[PDB]
């Protein structure tokens, strides 16, 4: 019998954009005692990239701050204060590597981790969103309705700093409830090598893929063609650079069917550019909800960018001389059953190993060992000759999955 949490036990708190504010709060952080709830909200899909515009904590004593990090940094706040204030205590964060970028990018510390997202994995739950996992543990409904929020928006209003509020509120009850059950399940010291390993890779610049210009949507569509490559190329790089100096979303000032349009296209003159329409006209998001008037305040700064800014990019990219333009384990199943059918047999046998101790053990087979793992393994004709619990280690497997699999895995591959 779940009950809806509706507000915070201390109800809406008003947000921290004054230096005085601050030092008062790191003050009340200092008088606290146990973990450090946390959290933070970003304008993704409306501003730039992914800088928080909102920092959530909450410490028995202290309470919730819902911190504004652009007014205190422009207040002068420093954030040496907060790290000083909070020390070696544990953040409780809900998929850490989600938020440990962003908290690092502000030069914040955390030195111990608790992932109650990690956590819940372990422990076999299937749907591990925050509110699924606050009403398996304490009986408490989170109504998550501000989640796709322009958290840019100033002042922010009553109903997303209760959305904020909330989502840091049963942070520290979770831990306690989530620690019991790991401990009787017998996966507490798996829990802390997970968070360890978090930590060491969240806190830092977050993982950009190998050639981001590569993932603009319907891409296929042109990948026969090096100068439509070249035209994609040229198009995205320059709307990545306008994105970030107008802090706007990339696909709001220039659409994805607009770049892949150009390049198969290929306008040489002002006259076939106005021909294509798409170009020419500013972005529309049209969601047919309230969304819609909140990406429309974007459209000052869409008008701002002028199509003729696009025509001298194309004009660049067509002038490039050809010999200028652009050309582990593959993830798909039928690459491996089409071309190295002997490889797969060998990777199936070890699939269905990591199965069974996934079964033995109830962990979910993705978090025994990340699947990658053992088709990086299996991704020879000499599998026989691998260290398996070398390989493992190397790929980036934790101690306790290496101690769990690797044998057993090693025991497939022999057959
Ligand atoms: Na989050
Ligand atoms: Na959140």
């Not at 333009?325 to 699939?351: G, T």
């Not at 079964?359 to 025994?368: C, F």
Request: with cysteine; charged share 30%; glycine share 4%.
């Amino acid at each position: 019998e779940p009950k809806l949490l509706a507000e915070p036990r201390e109800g809406v708190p008003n947000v921290i954009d004054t230096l005085p504010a601050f030092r008062d709060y790191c003050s009340e952080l200092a008088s606290s005692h146990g973990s450090l709830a946390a959290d933070a909200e970003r304008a993704s899909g409306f501003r730039y990239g992914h800088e928080d515009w909102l920092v959530q904590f909450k410490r028995d004593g202290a309470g919730i701050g819902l911190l504004d990090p652009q007014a205190l940094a422009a207040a002068g706040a420093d954030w040496n204060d907060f790290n000083r204030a909070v020390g070696d205590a544990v953040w409780i964060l809900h998929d850490s590597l989600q938020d440990l970028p962003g908290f690092d990018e502000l030069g914040m510390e955390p030195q111990r981790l608790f992932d109650t997202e990690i956590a819940a994995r372990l422990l076999g739950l299937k749907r591990f969103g925050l509110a699924a996992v606050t009403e398996h543990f304490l009986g408490l409904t989170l109504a998550k309705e501000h989640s796709a929020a322009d958290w840019s928006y100033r002042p922010l209003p009553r109903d997303w700093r209760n959305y904020a509020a909330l989502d840091v509120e049963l942070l520290i009850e979770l831990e306690t409830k989530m620690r019991a059950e790991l401990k009787r399940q017998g996966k507490m010291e798996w829990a802390q090598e997970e968070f360890d390993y978090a930590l060491k890779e969240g806190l830092g610049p977050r993982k950009e893929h190998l050639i981001p210009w590569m993932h603009v949507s319907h891409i296929t569509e042109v990948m026969r063609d090096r100068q439509a490559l070249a035209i994609v190329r040229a198009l995205w790089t320059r709307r990545d650079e306008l994105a970030r100096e107008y802090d706007i979303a990339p696909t709001l000032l220039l659409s994805d069917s607009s770049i892949i349009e150009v390049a198969k296209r290929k306008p040489h003159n002002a006259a076939q550019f106005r021909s294509i329409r798409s170009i020419n006209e500013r972005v529309r998001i049209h969601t047919d909800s309230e969304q819609d008037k909140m990406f429309e305040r974007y459209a000052p700064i869409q008008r701002k960018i002028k199509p003729s800014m696009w025509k001298n990019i194309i004009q660049d990219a067509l002038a490039l001389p050809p010999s200028e333009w652009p050309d582990s384990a593959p993830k798909s199943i039928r690459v491996w059953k089409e071309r190295y059918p002997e490889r797969l047999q060998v990777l199936n046998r070890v699939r269905k190993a990591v199965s069974q101790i996934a079964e033995d053990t109830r962990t979910p087979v993705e978090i025994v060992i990340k699947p990658q793992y053992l088709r990086n393994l299996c991704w020879t004709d000499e599998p026989r000759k691998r260290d398996v619990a070398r390989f493992l280690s190397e790929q980036g497997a934790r101690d306790w999955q290496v101690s769990l699999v690797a044998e057993s895995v090693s025991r497939a591959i022999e057959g």
